[PDB]
Amino acid sequence: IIGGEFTTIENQPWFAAIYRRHRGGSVTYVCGGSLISPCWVISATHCFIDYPKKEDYIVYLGRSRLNSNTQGEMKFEVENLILHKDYSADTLAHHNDIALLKIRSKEGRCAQPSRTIQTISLPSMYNDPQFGTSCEITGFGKENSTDYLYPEQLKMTVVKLISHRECQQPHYYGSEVTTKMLCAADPQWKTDSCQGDSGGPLVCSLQGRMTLTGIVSWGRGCALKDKPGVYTRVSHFLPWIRSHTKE
């Protein structure tokens, strides 16, 4: 997160931190996610497309720091990794950038809601917040595009939901942005999500309730003027989410 401020997991109890085991004995932070049900976490497919092996991932709930410990946190293994079939990437954009992860601890149990761990509500079938609404975003991502290290403390910030009319126009992006995407940015272009924030939640007020409106997906740079962040439009994927979280 460029700009914004440092906070704790209590401000975003639904935030899941995803880690991966690499070749050579190293473990690194990959992306963020959101707890939609006690056993289900939603993220972006591009976070796993290059390394589709579910046994190499580790999920943390209730974690406010990247390395040091936070009391009340819970470690989880990935029982099932579901990537969207129609996923495809260009040099311009990611498409159908959404993924589901079924988590389970060592005892085979799911998440236990606490003051630091809670699920986020999903939007209603084709019912998004009105454009111009203030939404929150979180993650352990970069504070500057140029940085090589991710911050140690969780960050969050606020951005404005932008209409497709605006985002789809050439003064911003173009044809690459579809109705399955949502754009949001800071009208002053000082705060935004960045590398390391992918898979994270874009939370907005829907029916006077905090709702998962989008998933951090892509953008040209980070906090670049006239280049808004692009999120996966969760509401346009409800049938998909429901059919995969059945039995």
Check residue 91 for interaction with ligand SL1 (CB under 6 A).
yes
- As annotated, the active-site residues are 46, 97, 198
Q: Is 110 left (phi over 0), alpha (psi -120 to 50) or beta?
A: beta
**Closer CB to ligand SL1, 111 or 141, in the complex:** 141
Q: Which of 62, 197, 212, 213 binds ligand SL1 (CB under 6 A)?
A: 197
Q: Interacting stretch for ligand SL1, rule CB under 6 A, among 10-18, 64-72, 85-93, 237-245?
A: 85-93
Q: How far apart are CA 112 and CA 225, in angstroms?
A: 42
Shortest distance (Å) from residue 92 CB to ligand SL1: 5
Q: How far apart are CA 92 and CA 173, in angstroms?
A: 9
Chain residue at closest Cβ approach to ligand SL1? 219
Q: Interacting stretch for ligand SL1, rule CB under 6 A, among 13-21, 203-211, 213-221, 239-247?
A: 213-221
Shortest distance (Å) from residue 242 CB to ligand SL1: 26
Identify residue 144 by its one-letter amino acid code: N
**Closer CB to ligand SL1, 71 or 91, in the complex:** 91
Q: How far apart are CA 162 and CA 172, in angstroms?
A: 11
Check residue 89 for interaction with ligand SL1 (CB under 6 A).
yes
- State the burial class of residue 183 (Cβ atoms within 10 Å of its Cβ: 0-12, 13-18, 19+): buried
Size of the site for ligand SL1 (CB under 6 A): 17
Residue indicated by tokens 């874009």 = 202
Q: Which two tokens stand for residue 51?
A: 């390394």
DSSP assigned state of 91: S
Q: Which of 36, 61, 110, 216 binds ligand SL1 (CB under 6 A)?
A: 216
Q: Interacting stretch for ligand SL1, rule CB under 6 A, among 4-12, 108-116, 161-169, 190-198?
A: 190-198
Q: Which residues pair with 100 in a beta bridge?
A: 42, 82
E strand map for 179-228: 181-185, 201-206, 209-218
Q: Which residues bind ligand SL1 (CB under 6 A)?
A: 89, 91-94, 192-195, 197-198, 216, 218-220, 222, 229
